[PDB]
Design a protein around this nucleic acid. Sequence first.
RNA 1: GCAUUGCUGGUGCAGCGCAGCGCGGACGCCCGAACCUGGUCAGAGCCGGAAGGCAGCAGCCAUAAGGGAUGCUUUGCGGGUGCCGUUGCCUUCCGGCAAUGC
Lengths: 283, 413
Amino acid sequence: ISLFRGKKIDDDLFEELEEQLLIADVGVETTRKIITNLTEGASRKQLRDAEALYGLLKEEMGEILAKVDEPLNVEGKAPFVILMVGVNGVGKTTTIGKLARQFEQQGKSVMLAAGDTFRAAAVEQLQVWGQRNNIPVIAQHTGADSASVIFDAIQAAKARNIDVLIADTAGRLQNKSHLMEELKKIVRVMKKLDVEAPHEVMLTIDASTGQNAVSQAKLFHEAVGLTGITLTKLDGTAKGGVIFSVADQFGIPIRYIGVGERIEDLRPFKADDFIEALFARED
Amino acid sequence: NLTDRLSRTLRNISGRGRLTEDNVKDTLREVRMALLEADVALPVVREFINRVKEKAVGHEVNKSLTPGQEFVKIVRNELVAAMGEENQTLNLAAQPPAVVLMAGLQGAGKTTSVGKLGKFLREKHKKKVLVVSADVYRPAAIKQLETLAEQVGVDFFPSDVGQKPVDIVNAALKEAKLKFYDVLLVDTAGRLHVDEAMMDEIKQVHASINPVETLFVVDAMTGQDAANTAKAFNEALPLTGVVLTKVDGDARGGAALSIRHITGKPIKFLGVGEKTEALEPFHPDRIASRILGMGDVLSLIEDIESKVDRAQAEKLASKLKKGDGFDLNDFLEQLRQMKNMGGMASLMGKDDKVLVRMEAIINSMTMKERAKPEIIKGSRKRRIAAGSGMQVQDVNRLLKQFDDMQRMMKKMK
RNA sequence: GCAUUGCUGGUGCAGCGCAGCGCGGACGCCCGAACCUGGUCAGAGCCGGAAGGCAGCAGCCAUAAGGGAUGCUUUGCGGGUGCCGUUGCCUUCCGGCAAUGC
Ligand SMILES: Nc1nc2c(ncn2[C@@H]2O[C@H](COP(=O)(O)OP(=O)(O)CP(=O)(O)O)[C@@H](O)[C@H]2O)c(=O)[nH]1
Ligand SMILES: Nc1nc2c(ncn2[C@@H]2O[C@H](COP(=O)(O)OP(=O)(O)CP(=O)(O)O)[C@@H](O)[C@H]2O)c(=O)[nH]1
Ligand SMILES: [Mg+2]
Ligand SMILES: [Mg+2]
């Protein structure tokens, strides 16, 4: 970032900015769309100062995330249902543990559902997150129907008077249609107790994931209808610039960001601070 | 468009000329844009563009096919060899109780692949497998491998969360050698390469137990980040194999070319599902065409080449079979070149009805009958005379004269 | 916390059904009969006084019999197929509301 100050504006510096934009996994259709706004913006004001390119980039990137900045409002409904969906191994179950503790912080009663009745010891894994927060977990032995288990967890969340219910699902890849109609099947049985439910369809996306995130958002939204996004494992070298392509194409709001394996390592999404961390020249 | 049909014919034209940057620069942009969309890192993309350039111009020029399509072959062929120099490099088991260490980032597919590895080495390779977990961080990660071990029918090593990961791997090998287990499959926690703390744990574990196979598990959909990941994980640990997971997905899998380039260690396994059955031995030919994306171009190049290859072989086989020098096809060509002469042999060599009759008999014969006179027999002789309007003796007379001709041809010239 | 009881749900079988895989045929594409299929019949053959015909081989085109690569197509048959659907059911296994008891 600091190396850009002591440089003159030319076609070589624009190529230096494009390569540092692509290395963030932003895309091709998304990177070249911003460069078209920058080359037009450099003639609009006619500025040959290095201080302007860093500012102009933060302005246009911050404009995209301005459309998708709405925070999650779990209050009002009883029980508010949050359906956790995404591909295999993105942080879904761990994110629920982080979420349930930020809602207890807000002063709302939380209950959990063990829906990954396909992966080994997934019930046991969510049960540990329940014990870490001192929250009830409605669960059945792995192999049982996920849709019918979440249905029994809602019937429990209603009767025990719970403010927020976070429902877990299995790791499913968008191309596996049978697993996709299984996700639709979950929501179908949910409407039998509350037509508004699920009140949120939170999609967890790994920061290190590339252009697969495009179809990950597309086919998950086309099937159930996403209303939330959590960009987890962002604590590493992973910038996860692919989120700019997602919001520009589908406009699903980003609710939280995963920055560690601990319960406290979760923050709500902030647009302006996210751009500053994208070009972070730190070791 | 009207200019569209005009511009298409100009490029479709046979480019006999040397493969130079002028034709490349226009179509090289399609390759660079596909590779970036495939999720291949920039240092490997930029180095591979220069790698193709040295081979493209260097005497590799074809007369047929589009100039922007004959360079695609150089991209495709160099992609297969760069990905898999050796096809199916299996885990070494020619030493005492073999140690297989599994390491990668958080949630790559380690414990599942340990389970999928169990079934491979147990059913297909018939070995005494022992599974261990050093993951004392992920909730119920120990119970996860315990169920996976029960699924395949492989013996599992007990562990606690209170137990130190360095002591688990040390005591694991102790029980492995005692019961003479063929392979010791070691599963470790999710580790971020940035973290100095746990990256020192895996290094200490790699030292504690000498792993004959250090398999680096990485997700198939991982983007540009794979550059930072492959560098640090090879610079810290001496890797011997890569395990690519979630390959069943619609993701191009650009990281696979990114991992093989930076580490230089060959990919050994491919995961094609959540199930235990979902393990395939590495093959680059399949994954190379999946990273490229453009299959409609390669489908025609391999279809046009085959059309040319079959035509070049068929037109040469007929010439090699007719290379004997003489047959009735050559004899008929001699008659017409003689009849064309306005003076005739009758007036030159000091009988006319014989030559006119001889042309009709060979004319009634098939292509096979002309090439080989020996196949003409009983019913074959009766067919020639019926259509020619001659006799069985006329055909037999003609064949005798031809037999003495080839005897005279082979003896002289 | 445990049992009993009611309702409900999943697993679990079992029977139909789909999806799928294997094998057989359709349809189609391509190849394809010296002669004993047809069209066209060069050369050559025949009948008549001529004029005109008749017969027909190669080739070339079409194509029975029969091969071959394959197909979001169609169907019949069969499964140490099945992160599907459905009806039925029993032994246990496990959940969800609700009533009692220690
Ligand atoms: N470093 C880091 N690791 C994370 C983060 N979020 C989750 N993880 C980790 O990633 C791994 C997978 O997390 P998990 O919560 O099991 O993911 P999942 O999507 O539920 C896995 P499945 O699809 O199988 O249910 C775990 O090791 C976990 O600790 C994060 O923000 N940072
Ligand atoms: N579809 C598909 N899923 C896979 C493949 N390999 C692993 N998975 C899945 O990805 C998820 C993560 O797998 P897991 O084996 O727990 O990964 P891990 O790296 O051990 C997680 P941690 O880092 O916490 O130990 C699981 O849901 C699992 O079923 C694959 O090849 N295909
Ligand atoms: Mg999970
Ligand atoms: Mg693991």
